[PDB]
């Protein structure tokens, strides 16, 4: 192997400006990092700058450097959708024609009618809502009637809440499996069906640790599958295992925040493995992008940047660090949906003694998967062109 270990970091939703097809998605004008930099009156990300972030694109407080630490470019998304699953599945070598759907006005009558028909249960709610707020609103009715609270949010999710002492947990799980099957349908394709059991009483409801998430498997066998099948390590950190429904994962590390995600990355740097360590930093998307909160987003990016020097200190000569994103989620943009943007790519190894240079623009996210696959001598993905030899 050229590299013994590859550390891949997805800064979730950290877009670097509207993609060529942004108009199709209602994303003209989008610019995640650039708009945040303007709001912050200059972002402070000196470590990303040292890697060559500004060499990709200059933004307020983010300037180019004469000798970037590693190689740099951006990537263009080829798949139809701008959701997390699409972005990640493409990154690991796939092409996804069918986009996952979001439901700002709730789910179509047709879908909920069939779910009622298959379960013998009534559905209430059917709207975007905070999980805790909707419990306050409808939890009592749910308890008295045995109906199901169905709701959604800014992401591609169908969530089903029911009181544990009214609807048995195993019945809630069965219902969610039925919903998961019904939503394998392009008309209502949801990324995730989530069981949301709760306990307590009106004015005092608590959601239990018995949450279960029902994901779809990637529409193809990924570079992660190939690594695992060839006996390499594939360490998933944060949402990564869930995003791929565990496909090709050899160890999974749960995280609670971006800072915790950087701690787990450091943990993997301390491990003797051969293969891939794959981190998703999800706070950017979950707390700041969808909430259209550029101040929180800017602070999170600065908190993340401050962690990088320890990562640089731990990387070995035969380690490669890859930093990218899976789409945009511009916190100064209409609505609450993701944005169709280019994503940054930074590629750094301490063995790059003269620093890096500009890579040709990546025409699909799958170029990352192809690079990983070629490095480890496993079956090349169908899509994507490796940049391994450029490094
Ligand atoms: O807490 P809730 O409002 O029920 O659900 C919000 C999100 O919490 C989970 O990460 C899922 O991604 C949901 O979209
Ligand atoms: Mn838009
Ligand atoms: Mn994402
Ligand atoms: Mn999202
Ligand atoms: Mn603040």
Curated annotation (Swiss-Prot):
It comes from the Bacteria. It is an enzyme of class 5 (isomerase). Keywords: Cytoplasm, Isomerase, Manganese, Metal-binding. Mn(2+) 2 binds at residues 285, 290, 338. It catalyses: 2-deoxy-alpha-D-ribose 1-phosphate = 2-deoxy-D-ribose 5-phosphate; alpha-D-ribose 1-phosphate = D-ribose 5-phosphate. Its cofactor is Mn(2+). One of its GO terms (biological process) is nucleotide metabolic process. Mn(2+) 1 binds at residues 12, 326-327. Gene3D superfamilies: Alkaline Phosphatase, subunit A, Phosphopentomutase. Binds 2 manganese ions. Pathway: Carbohydrate degradation; 2-deoxy-D-ribose 1-phosphate degradation; D-glyceraldehyde 3-phosphate and acetaldehyde from 2-deoxy-alpha-D-ribose 1-phosphate: step 1/2. It is found in: Cytoplasm. The keyword Isomerase applies. InterPro entries: Alkaline_phosphatase_core_sf (IPR017850), DeoB (IPR010045), Metalloenzyme (IPR006124), Phosphopentomutase_DeoB_cap_sf (IPR024052). Coiled coil: none annotated. Pfam families: Metalloenzyme. GO terms for molecular function: magnesium ion binding; manganese ion binding; phosphopentomutase activity. One of its GO terms (cellular component) is cytosol. Its EC number is 5.4.2.7. Belongs to the phosphopentomutase family. Isomerase that catalyzes the conversion of deoxy-ribose 1-phosphate (dRib-1-P) and ribose 1-phosphate (Rib-1-P) to deoxy-ribose 5-phosphate (dRib-5-P) and ribose 5-phosphate (Rib-5-P), respectively. This is Phosphopentomutase. It comes from Bacillus cereus (strain ATCC 14579 / DSM 31 / CCUG 7414 / JCM 2152 / NBRC 15305 / NCIMB 9373 / NCTC 2599 / NRRL B-3711).
């Amino acid at each position: 192997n050229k590299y013994k270990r590859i550390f891949l970091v997805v800064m979730d939703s950290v877009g670097i400006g509207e993609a060529p097809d942004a108009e199709q998605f209602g994303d003209l004008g989008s610019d995640t990092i650039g708009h945040i930099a303007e709001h912050m009156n200059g972002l402070q990300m000196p470590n990303m700058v040292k890697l060559g972030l500004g060499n990709i694109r200059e933004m307020k407080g983010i300037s180019k450097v004469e000798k970037p630490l590693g190689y740099y470019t951006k990537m263009q998304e080829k798949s139809t959708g701008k959701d997390t699953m699409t972005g990640h599945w493409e990154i690991m070598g796939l092409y996804i024609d069918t986009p996952f759907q979001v439901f700002p006005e709730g789910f179509p009558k047709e879908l909920l009618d069939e779910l009622e028909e298959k379960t013998g249960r009534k559905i209430i709610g059917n709207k975007p809502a905070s999980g805790t707020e909707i419990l306050d609103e409808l939890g009592q009715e749910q308890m008295e009637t045995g109906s199901l609270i169905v709701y959604t949010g800014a992401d591609s999710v169908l969530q089903i809440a029911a009181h544990e002492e009214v609807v048995p947990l195993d019945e809630l799980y069965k219902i969610c499996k039925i919903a998961r099957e019904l939503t394998l349908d392009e008309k209502y394709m949801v990324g995730r069906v989530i069981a949301r059991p709760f306990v307590g009483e009106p004015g005092n409801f608590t959601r239990t640790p018995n949450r279960h998430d029902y994901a779809l498997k990637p529409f193809g066998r990924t570079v992660m599958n190939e690594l695992k099948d060839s006996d390499y390590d594939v360490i998933a950190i944060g949402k990564i295992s869930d995003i791929y429904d565990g496909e090709g994962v050899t160890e999974s590390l749960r995280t609670k925040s971006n800072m915790d995600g950087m701690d787990k990355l450091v943990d993997t740097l301390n491990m003797d493995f051969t293969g891939l360590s794959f981190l998703n930093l999800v706070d950017f998307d979950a707390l700041f992008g969808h909430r259209r909160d550029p101040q929180g987003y800017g602070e999170a990016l600065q908190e993340y940047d401050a962690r990088l020097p320890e990562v640089f200190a731990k990387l070995k000569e035969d380690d490669l660090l890859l930093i990218t994103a899976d789409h945009g989620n511009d916190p100064i943009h209409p609505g609450t949906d993701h944005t169709r943007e280019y994503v940054p790519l930074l590629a750094y190894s301490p063995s790059m003694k003269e620093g890096g240079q500009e890579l040709p623009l990546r025409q699909t996210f799958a170029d990352i998967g192809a690079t990983v696959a070629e490095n480890f001598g496993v079956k090349m993905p169908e899509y994507g062109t490796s940049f391994l030899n450029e490094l």
